[PDB]
Amino acid sequence: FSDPDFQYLAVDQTAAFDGKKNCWVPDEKEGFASAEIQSSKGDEITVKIVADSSTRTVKKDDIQSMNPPKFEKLEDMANMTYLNEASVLYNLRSRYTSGLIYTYSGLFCIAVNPYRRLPIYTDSVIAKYRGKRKTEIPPHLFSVADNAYQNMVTDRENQSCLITGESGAGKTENTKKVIMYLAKVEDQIIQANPVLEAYGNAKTTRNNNSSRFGKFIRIHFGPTGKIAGADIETYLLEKSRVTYQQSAERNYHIFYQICSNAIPELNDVMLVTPDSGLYSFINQGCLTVDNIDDVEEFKLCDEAFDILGFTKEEKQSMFKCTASILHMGEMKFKQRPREEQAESDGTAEAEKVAFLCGINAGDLLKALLKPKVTKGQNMNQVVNSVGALAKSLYDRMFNWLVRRVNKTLDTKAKRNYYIGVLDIAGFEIFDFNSFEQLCINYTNERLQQFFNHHMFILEQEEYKKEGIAWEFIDFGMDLQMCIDLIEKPMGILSILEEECMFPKADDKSFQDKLYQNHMGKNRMFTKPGKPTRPNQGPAHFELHHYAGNVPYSITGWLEKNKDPINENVVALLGASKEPLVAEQTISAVHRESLNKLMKNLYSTHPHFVRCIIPNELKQPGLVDAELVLHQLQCNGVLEGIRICRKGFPSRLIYSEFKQRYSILAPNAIPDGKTVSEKILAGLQMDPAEYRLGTTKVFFKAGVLGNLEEMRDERLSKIISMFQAHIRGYLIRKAYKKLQDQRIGLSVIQRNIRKWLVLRNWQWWKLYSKVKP
Amino acid sequence: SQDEIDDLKDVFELFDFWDGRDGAVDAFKLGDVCRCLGINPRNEDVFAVGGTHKMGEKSLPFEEFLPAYEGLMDCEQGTFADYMEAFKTFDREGQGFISGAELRHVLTALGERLSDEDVDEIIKLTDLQEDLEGNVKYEDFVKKVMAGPYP
Amino acid sequence: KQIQEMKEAFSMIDVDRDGFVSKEDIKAISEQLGRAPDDKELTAMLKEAPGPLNFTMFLSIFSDKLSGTDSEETIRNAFAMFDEQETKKLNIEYIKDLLENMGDNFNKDEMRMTFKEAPVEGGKFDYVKFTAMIKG
Ligand SMILES: Nc1ncnc2c1ncn2[C@@H]1O[C@H](COP(=O)(O)OP(=O)(O)O)[C@@H](O)[C@H]1O
Ligand code: VO4
Ligand SMILES: [Ca+2]
Ligand SMILES: [Mg+2]
Ligand SMILES: [Mg+2]
């Protein structure tokens, strides 16, 4: 439209294209290659690669139909002739290498990580997307958000966006832009991310800012359709990162912020020396982070605590408890050759700890080396309960922190409906995978299957309900299993859960008790295979997850699931001086949180966002077709599009339909279900492009977009006709005024011509002369 | 009909006279002419039959005029239903209101725009008034405009 | 009073004080004042009166001239019909525009002849004073 605001948003296409020569042939580097057939031979087709101009043969049933240049960089792929893994991957990759990272796949959106900042989220751009219908303007995440808003409003129901993808794809970035968007069409909300991310994110090999907890944030709306409140829910924070961090990875962001000197004044409040590589608990893996300024992030994090409305004590309570942790791990120990129970190796660092937590350093190390009926602990039983304490504190801090930020957001204002956003942590496969991962992965599964249900299983059901016409289609997309292998009655977790309650148990009775139940009785469970990546640590079994095969090491899974902190120290801290400090298995508990989340989701009109990691190098604008293609597979994109083209994804309640499309045949409207029977009848609408329904109308694909076309047109005309009416009124109003002047001018014109000709009369001349 | 064509005649004069009497009218006025005989065509409408964007462009006799009016007759006129419908799409409350500011926007900004003058005009004519919140019952307004300058 | 003048006039014009106006009567008085008409002018100037010019056929042709015209009130209004604000003055560019190319368009001469007299001072052309001048 010439609008500068569309530089990396609007698509910028002819000849050399034979619909019978040109096709898609499998490739190892690119996934699919542009080929031109040369010679058939039963099944052995011989094609020529357009790129290098090399030649090869390919089974006839392995050729894929290419799409005509007509659909270059298409905005909506459901509109393409061919929706196959090679047409899709080509369209995306086409757009992507041109700045366009958003593309509709039918009813849901696709976001391909840019790995660079784009001027597409400005307020300039937000202005243009407001109240726009998806077909009206380029593909964008705003459109997805803007539309969910309109639906909640007009349809009067809760909306929801499940933003999925792999780890490092764009789940978080996009979740934030959605809220930032909905917020712009407030300040504290936006500001809750900086603090939650500082405490629940960390550098990882995959992500320099990896989210380590699940986030579900609901945004409430009032009777005028404006933001009237908001709440946050979090899930499974990586208690383990606190004390441990695999190489090339960092602990949570805060710890590094705290040792930078962004606010020197605080150094003495926390008792920290501005050196991170000084504290064991946070210098195991990485220290710095290409493109993360811990100095400035600390400042902004501090700045954000203020805006959130945190008293200075409150926000210093936080900072201290977390700096305290930086010390729990500095407390050295020793034995004393004899019994070993264990003795300390100083007390300097163990005091700073008791100090910051407002408890007696004495009473501490005491209830830590001989927990009370007493029961002394050896030299490791201690260093490990130290960690048990660090982890458990941090899990309470993070939980309290969220409760508090909700205090600041649960405005008691009036709520109608809401729009939730789900960002759960995604699939990740590392050199070594343990309980933490199974938990994240089980989580991510889960979700995918939701999309499968609501997308295929679901669609057809409604067709039945309404009582239309149709024949089933098996998209063969179910993971209930994988899901089942892990969650069901005798599943993996259930086995582990019943294994914890036994003090006798160990890493081998658990490992054996596992094969005992699923080896050969469930094909998803398979003995550990062979290395597909160097440094591949131990593996005890493998699981075939939607997006990958994961070799899991079950060592230490029993303690990891049954937590354990000296019930003694919990007494010390129970009555500590600091006011903050003073204030079921994990598996079962989480399984339950998750089930509850899912339950909350189902009651929604979901809009899906699909994130995609372009490559394994973290560098921008570079594509790895294999990987890409691979995602376009385990995510169900293609199928996700077939039904949009195949079936009838629209649906309208006659009540809301009559109200919006009456203005298209009003000279035929004298019951909402018959009125529409009329309108759509008047329009002489093809029985094909639509269907009956008991309570709702079903319009084939695109048709509704086209009805909003005709809808506008009429609305524009009518507006003109009333302007015409106003033009005609004003004219006719000044009609008297125009008869009078027509006469009043003829007087003057005829009566001056007289006095003019009378002076050109000799007689009069001479007369006038005599006068005196 | 005759009494009809006579009416075209009547008005044709008042006009052909004002842009210099000579038995010809500036095609740029063909609109206003018909707007006087009751009808309210749309600018899109008028140009379709012969109207022009500017004066001077061209003048027309009564001979060529007859069909322009035959034309602008068969063209659609907006009913009360239609004006009510369209105006509803700007009412979030649903209670027949709108603000001055917005109404102004609809007239001046959407559809075949209307100068800012014609607006303050018809406002003052129909004597449309806003309340304390600065809102107006669009139902009343539509009724007046529909009414005529002399009801 | 229009008559009272006519007579006293006919008197000054009827030089040879014979109660009649002759080619010599006209020629006579004209010259005593300003340039006078040529024979042809004087000839057709009289032929305008069927028979001898007594003070009767005189008042006859003069009255039949000034006949077919309206009021000083009727005209002063056809004017105030463009004087919206009721200021009793028309803006010169306006009036000139009206007469010049509107209705029964005037011509440059009609235009010059008309404004050569017109009372315009300060941009505004006083149609009152000018309605009088053109009338009584
Ligand atoms: N739309 C985008 N624009 C710019 N960078 C982005 C975009 N989406 C993702 N990224 C980049 O990818 C990184 C990982 O994205 P993120 O949303 O944190 O992934 P996850 O899906 O794991 O939440 C971000 O820190 C940023 O560098
Ligand atoms: O890396 V992400 O855990 O935010 O999927
Ligand atoms: Ca004319
Ligand atoms: Mg994230
Ligand atoms: Mg004589």
Helices and strands in order:
The complex is a heterotrimer of chains A (772), B (151) and C (136).
Chain A: E1 22-26, E2 32-39, E3 44-49, E4 55-59, H1 85-96, E5 102-105, E6 108-112, H2 123-129, H3 141-156, E7 159-164, H4 171-184, H5 187-199, E8 201-202, E9 210-211, E10 214-221, E11 227-235, H6 253-257, H7 267-270, H8 294-307, H9 314-328, E12 333-334, E13 343-344, H10 348-356, H11 361-369, H12 379-409, E14 417-423, H13 435-466, H14 480-487, H15 492-500, H16 507-518, E15 525-526, E16 541-545, E17 548-552, H17 557-561, H18 569-572, H19 579-582, H20 586-602, E18 605-612, H21 625-634, H22 637-646, E19 652-653, H23 654-661, H24 672-682, E20 690-691, E21 696-699, H25 703-733, H26 737-757, H27 762-770
Parallel strand pairs in A: 6-18, 7-14, 7-18
Antiparallel strand pairs in A: 1-2, 2-3, 3-4, 5-6, 8-9, 10-11, 10-14, 12-13, 15-16, 16-17, 19-21, 20-21
Helix pairs in contact in A: 1-21, 3-4, 5-8, 5-12, 9-10, 9-12, 10-11, 13-14, 15-16, 23-24
Chain B: H1 2-18, E1 25-26, H2 30-36, H3 43-49, E2 59-60, H4 62-71, H5 80-88, H6 100-109, H7 116-126, H8 138-147
Antiparallel strand pairs in B: 1-2
Helix pairs in contact in B: 5-8
Chain C: H1 2-13, H2 23-31, H3 39-46, H4 55-63, H5 72-80, E1 90-91, H6 92-101, H7 108-115, E2 124-125, H8 127-134
Helix pairs in contact in C: 5-8
The complex binds adenosine-5'-diphosphate, vanadate ion, calcium ion (CA) and magnesium ion (MG) (2 copies).
PDB class: contractile protein
Keywords: myosin motor, conformational changes, contractile protein
Assembly: trimeric
